[PDB]
């Protein structure tokens, strides 16, 4: 609109109304132009391709996107709080994405020294899928999201995605995307951009730990009137077998019957805490549950949502079970235990068979005068008929969404990360500077702000519970700093994981 | 015709553990380094980003659809065993004491990546030209091949860590899968069983499912 | 001085009886530190017999002291207890509770590298094993 | 264990260095602790995590760790200063154990 006119207000509160909560997150952003503005192929042929697990073939674009699908990009460690602590569920409503104060810097070296001056005339290139035509990569659990400390300035990441291959090879079933044949809008310095979006209903994610277990549903005062068998002999000796039969009651409570059974698993390698008890060998990736695609082994990350550990148990962990989150300051390459966060679903126990343990036991043979009875042990169970099971739980670090794959059929189809499947999640953003002038190009960068605002339907707590529930609290010691805040350098970190799971139900 | 979702008539132009970025990062990180190093007593736990490196350990949110494996045969006879293994190796299941062949039974992929030869024994539909379902494998496990691994214990510094196979693996939450194509000469609907339950009811040798066909 | 360990239970026993030993925390919440053991002999250097979680999940012993001591605590109590059977005159000492520093909770795990270090201790109570 | 040389000598206003040897297990991959204990007292914490101190001791005690060797260093040595010191790690080895270093007794000479 006009060079000395600014294109938007800052936007940063929570406020609570009613069932809904309405969060908005304004940042600050610097893109650069990527690849000398080129479109290039990329594959582990460039890195050498060494695995075959390893192998990816895709292209590199000059377009970077906008990310905020991690939860504390929209909430404050006191909103995250005054959500987990107060209510049941909750679920993204809307989305309104805001792009203004465009500024276009150029970069002027000359002679070694380097002056940065306004460009008013230059452009930046922004659209959105609406159709979902491009890959999607925002489900990945992906690095350059915004920054969850209002005043940090963060980097867009670049623009890339992966199609078939074989080895580093190409096939003729790959796919190529060019950017540039998408209608785009063009912004100077005065322009703004924006757009609403709607998410599709989904079912609110459960904030909340079962107060019973899956096995003591029943009334513990009555005798069931139920049989079970209790005697398959009168006593030790030859030829002594009988058949007896006595009433399932609260003094043998495992052979009682019952109508629902505890969700499906698939067992992970359990690590120990105390590096003396694990087993003096690399087993990280040998000792790993994977699953095998078109010839390759994937790992089995985190995968099924399963308990961490046995109720009673604090050191000891799944090997891919759990998202593990890194501190601030933590190196990309394999950094000591303390620098890492490991997160614990330890809440979904009750429903759920803990991930390092059997299912369950099945008879392997028919006994008989001359044979045994014989069971084996159940390291995986697919989804029987009666099975009832939690997700694994979300975190203010953690992601917020994933899109659901597109497919004939799926099943449970909510993701594995955490967070709400859906077949339209919200739309990609694409971002870039328009090339001003072909091999030589102008050394230039853009910067302004964006704006997000979420809005968010909530389930209340209408429990009766007498006793008062666990809630997430500061805990209240001298200490040189205050949890997430910022330390005398100027450096906001979050120095712990926080689940959702705080208040309790009836199961 | 009752309401049936669209075939789908399309190959996926990615695979599911595919999807990321391949120029990020991700924010999760793995257990790269049990031992510091060889020698006794070198004990230790190190971790690492998952990133465009090192791809199959990323966290993922979706995984492969169910399997049930089929005994693989070579279209080059002398690779084949030397023995009479259609009925006494094949894949079945059984019903009243009855054992029937599992055929052509869940969507699976016909064959891996450059392996153009083999096919499942009974996975296929034979009309003799035998059809081989190619385009599943982004989404389906191989025929041939077990879904994974699964650890059969707990390791300790006695044991060392210990897997097994996974040679069927039932429906589980977060799983895809393709159906079986549709073929020119191949049936287009089929009657879906009159029963209390029934799980994505496309019937197995391709088509459409119906509860009033026809 | 807002954190404070008491120790109780200490005496003069016979060699091959058993004594308790506890300690009374306050100050700080208890079932979030993992408390240990430290024995310091007359005109000897300090000795770490044991340690447990702040669950109560996990114990260490050092050698010498394992399998005739046994480490518990009762996190409503706010009490770490440590017996002692099959005593002997080596295990003449004055025994200190101490506080494990690091804080840690259930969304993380306990981990025995981090979670021993000791910010303070108590003030100790001697046991003498004679005959 | 973790060695200590058994006595450390200085003057009024000097630096003195105590140092512990240690192996790969405790103190080459485990933070260092330091214990300022006066005979008949329980002991108190000097350093932890290798070089940081908590609050409420003197700024001129100082702890740094290279290696397998770890050395506490105090600056403007003080009569108050003299007291025996500890050295202590977690030690991954041998079941897991936290250690003690045999002490060290600083004498301030003058």
């Known amino acids: 609109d006009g060079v000395g006119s600014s294109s938007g207000n800052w936007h940063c509160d929570s406020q609570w109304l009613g069932d809904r909560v309405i969060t908005t997150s304004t940042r600050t952003w610097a893109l650069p132009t990527y690849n000398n503005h080129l479109y290039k192929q990329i594959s582990n042929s460039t890195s050498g391709g060494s695995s075959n697990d390893n192998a990816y073939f895709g292209y590199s674009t000059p377009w970077g996107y906008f990310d905020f699908n991690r939860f504390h990009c929209h909430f404050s460690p006191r909103d995250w709080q005054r959500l987990i602590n107060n209510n049941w569920g909750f679920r993204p409503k809307r989305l309104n994405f805001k792009l203004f104060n465009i500024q276009v810097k150029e970069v002027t070296d000359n002679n070694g020294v380097k002056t940065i001056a306004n460009n008013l005339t230059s452009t930046v290139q922004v659209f959105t899928d609406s159709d979902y035509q491009l890959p999607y990569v925002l489900g990945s659990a992906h690095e350059g999201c915004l920054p969850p400390f209002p005043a940090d300035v963060f980097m867009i990441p670049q623009y890339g995605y992966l199609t078939l291959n074989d080895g580093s090879q190409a096939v003729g079933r790959s796919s190529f995307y060019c950017l540039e044949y998408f209608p785009s809008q063009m912004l100077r310095t005065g322009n703004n951009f924006q757009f609403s979006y709607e998410f599709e209903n989904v079912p609110f994610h459960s904030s909340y730990a079962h107060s019973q277990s899956l096995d003591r549903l029943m009334n513990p005062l009555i005798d069931q009137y139920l049989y079970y068998l209790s005697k398959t002999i009168n006593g030790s000796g030859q030829n002594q077998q009988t058949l007896k039969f006595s009433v399932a009651g609260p003094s043998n409570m495992a052979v009682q019957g019952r109508n629902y059974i505890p969700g499906p698993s698939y067992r992970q390698q359990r690590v120990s805490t105390t590096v003396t008890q694990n087993n003096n060998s690399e087993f990280a990736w040998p000792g790993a549950s994977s699953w095998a695609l078109n010839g390759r082994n994937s790992l089995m990350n985190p995968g099924p949502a399963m308990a961490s550990h046995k109720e009673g148990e604090d050191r000891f962990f799944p090997l891919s079970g759990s998202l593990i989150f890194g501190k601030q300051g933590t190196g990309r390459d394999n950094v000591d235990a303390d620098k890492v966060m490991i997160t614990n679903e330890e809440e979904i126990k009750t429903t759920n068979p803990v991930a390092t343990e059997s299912y369950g036991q099945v008879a392997t043979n028919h006994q008989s005068a001359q044979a045994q009875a014989q069971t084996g042990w159940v390291q995986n169970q697919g989804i029987l008929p009666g099975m009832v099971w939690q997700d694994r739980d979300v975190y203010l670090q953690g992601p917020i969404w994933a899109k659901i794959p597109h497919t004939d059929g799926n099943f449970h189809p909510s993701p594995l990360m955490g967070g709400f499947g859906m077949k339209h999640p919200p739309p990609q953003i694409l971002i870039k500077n328009t090339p001003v002038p072909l091999n030589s190009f102008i050394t230039q960068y853009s910067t302004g702000q964006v704006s997000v605002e979420i809005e968010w339907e909530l389930q209340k707590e209408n429990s009766k519970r007498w006793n008062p529930e666990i809630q997430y609290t500061s805990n209240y010691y001298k200490s040189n700093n205050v949890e997430f805040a910022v330390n005398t350098e100027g450096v906001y970190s979050e120095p712990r994981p926080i689940g959702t799971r705080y208040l309790t139900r009836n199961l | 015709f009752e309401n049936v979702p669209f075939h789908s008539s399309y190959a996926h132009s990615q695979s599911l553990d595919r999807l990321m970025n391949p120029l990020i990062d991700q924010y999760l990180y793995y257990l790269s380094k049990t031992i510091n190093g060889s020698g006794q007593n070198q004990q230790t736990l190190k971790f690492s980003v998952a990133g465009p490196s090192n791809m199959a350990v990323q966290g993922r949110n979706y995984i492969p659809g169910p399997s049930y494996r089929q005994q693989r045969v070579s279209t080059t006879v002398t690779q084949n065993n030397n023995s009479e293994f259609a009925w006494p190796g094949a894949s079945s299941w059984a019903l009243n004491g009855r054992n029937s062949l599992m055929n052509p039974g869940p969507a699976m992929a016909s064959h891996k990546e450059g392996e153009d030869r083999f096919f499942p024994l009974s996975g296929s539909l034979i009309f003799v030209m035998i059809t081989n379902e190619e385009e599943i494998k982004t989404t389906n496990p191989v025929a041939t091949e077990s879904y994974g691994q699964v650890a059969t214990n707990h390791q300790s510094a006695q044991a060392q860590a210990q897997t097994g196979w996974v040679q069927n693996q039932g429906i589980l939450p977060g799983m895809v899968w393709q159906d079986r194509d549709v073929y020119l000469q191949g049936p287009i609907w089929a009657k879906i069983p009159h029963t209390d339950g029934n799980f994505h009811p496309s019937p197995l040798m391709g088509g459409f499912g119906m509860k009033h066909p026809p | 001085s807002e954190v404070q360990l008491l120790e109780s239970g200490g005496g003069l026993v016979q060699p091959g009886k058993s004594l308790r030993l506890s300690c009374a925390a306050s100050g700080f919440s208890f079932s979030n530190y993992a408390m240990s053991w430290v024995r310091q002999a007359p005109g000897k250097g300090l000795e770490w017999v044991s340690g447990?979680?702040?669950?109560?999940?996990?114990?260490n012993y050092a050698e010498s002291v394992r399998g005739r001591f046994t480490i518990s605590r009762d996190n409503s109590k706010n009490t770490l207890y440590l017996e002692m059977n099959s005593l002997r005159v080596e295990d003449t000492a004055v025994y200190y509770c101490?506080?494990?520093?690091?804080?840690?909770?259930?969304?993380?795990?306990?981990?025995?590298?981090?979670?021993?270090?000791?910010?303070?201790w108590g003030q100790g109570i001697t046991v003498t094993v004679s005959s | 264990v973790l060695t200590q040389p058994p006595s450390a000598s200085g003057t009024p206003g000097q630096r003195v260095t105590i140092s512990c040897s240690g192996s790969?297990?405790?103190?080459?991959?485990?933070?260092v602790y330091w214990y300022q204990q006066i005979p008949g007292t329980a002991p108190k914490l000097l350093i932890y995590?290798?070089?940081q101190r908590p609050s409420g001791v003197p700024d001129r005690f100082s702890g740094s760790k290279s290696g397998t060797s770890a050395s506490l260093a105090i600056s403007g040595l003080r009569s108050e200063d003299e007291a025996d010191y500890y050295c202590?790690?977690?030690?991954?080895?041998?079941?897991?154990?936290?250690?003690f270093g045999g002490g060290t007794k600083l004498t301030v000479l003058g």
């Open positions: 202590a790690a977690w030690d991954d080895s041998l079941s897991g154990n936290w250690v």
């Open positions: 101490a506080k494990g520093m690091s804080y840690y909770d259930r969304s993380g795990y306990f981990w025995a590298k981090y979670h021993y270090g000791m910010d303070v």
């Open positions: 790969s297990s405790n103190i080459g991959s485990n933070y």
């Open positions: 447990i979680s702040g669950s109560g999940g996990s114990t």
């Open positions: 995590s290798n070089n």
